[PDB]
Amino acid sequence: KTVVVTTILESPYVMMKKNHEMLEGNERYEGYCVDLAAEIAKHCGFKYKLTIVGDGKYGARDADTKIWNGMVGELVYGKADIAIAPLTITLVREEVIDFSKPFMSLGISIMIKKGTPIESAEDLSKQTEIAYGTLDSGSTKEFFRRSKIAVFDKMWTYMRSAEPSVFVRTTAEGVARVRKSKGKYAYLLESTMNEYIEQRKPCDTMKVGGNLDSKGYGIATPKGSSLGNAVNLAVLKLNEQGLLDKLKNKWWYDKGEC
Ligand SMILES: Cc1onc(O)c1C[C@H](N)C(=O)O
Numbered sequence: 001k002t003v004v005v006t007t008i009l010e011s012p013y014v015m016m017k018k019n020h021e022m023l024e025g026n027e028r029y030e031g032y033c034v035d036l037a038a039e040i041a042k043h044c045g046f047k048y049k050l051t052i053v054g055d056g057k058y059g060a061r062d063a064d065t066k067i068w069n070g071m072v073g074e075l076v077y078g079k080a081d082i083a084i085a086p087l088t089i090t091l092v093r094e095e096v097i098d099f100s101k102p103f104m105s106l107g108i109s110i111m112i113k114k115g116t117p118i119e120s121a122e123d124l125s126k127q128t129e130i131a132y133g134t135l136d137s138g139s140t141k142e143f144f145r146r147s148k149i150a151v152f153d154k155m156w157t158y159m160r161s162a163e164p165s166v167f168v169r170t171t172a173e174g175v176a177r178v179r180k181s182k183g184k185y186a187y188l189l190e191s192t193m194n195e196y197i198e199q200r201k202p203c204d205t206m207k208v209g210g211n212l213d214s215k216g217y218g219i220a221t222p223k224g225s226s227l228g229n230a231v232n233l234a235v236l237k238l239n240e241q242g243l244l245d246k247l248k249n250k251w252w253y254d255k256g257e258c
């Protein structure tokens with residue numbers, strides 16, 4: 001009956017409202033994905049319940065365990081009916097779950113502390129004083145692990161062996177590390193997140209260089225779900241009406257602190 005939506009606490013997609021302890025259910029959250037979930041549900045005609053993914057991950061398959069974690073896992077093992085989050089459409093994920101056409105276009109980018117002498121991925125690969133890493137259990141880490149292009153392969157070789165670990169559990173952890181490391185740590189994350197953080201106080205970070213790739217976020221459902229068709233049509237309809245652009249402007253720039 002009520003559609004269980006799995007999502008992740010990642011600003012500005014899903015965040016706890018200031019007054020959340022005094023609110024119930026869906027009303028406890030706010031953000032781009034909260035606004036989008038309400039719209040997808042209206043257009044598809046279903047009631048839903050937002051739930052935060054238990055392990056706080058996007059989703060990756062464990063080598064040997066072979067078990068999918070994160071939001072992807074919630075869909076794969078039937079714990080959730082749909083995932084509405086900044087979840088990247090990738091080949092390994094699409095082999096186990098279905099994705100709508102993209103609701104947001106983005107690419108991996110570099111985040112630096114203002115003043116850091118780095119202008120590109122090539123710059124990072126060619127040096128060692130400035131450490132750099134990515135988020136764990138996601139599409140960004142897999143991009144570097146599977147890349148056959150020289151610069152990225154060199155970056156992966158360094159990242160996989162760096163000590164202490166250059167990988168972080170959450171985006172907020174990556175941003176804090178950039179902010180606290182005096183220019184000695186750069187963070188590789190999706191352009192969407194980079195652009196968002198660039199507009200938040202203390203306004204000390206910035207996106208440098210172009211995107212390393214081009215991809216998109218999709219609304220995900222278990223393979224063969226009855227919801228897939230309507231959800232994809234809803235995403236296409238909402239993008240064409242300008243809603244997705246209005247939502248990005250609202251959560252990224254209208255509320256910008258810089
Ligand atoms: C958001 C975000 O920003 N940088 C990232 O790697 C991610 C996670 C990425 N969207 C995923 O699906 O794994």
Ligand SMILES: [Zn+2]
Nearest residue numbers: 039042043238
């Ligand atoms: Zn609508």
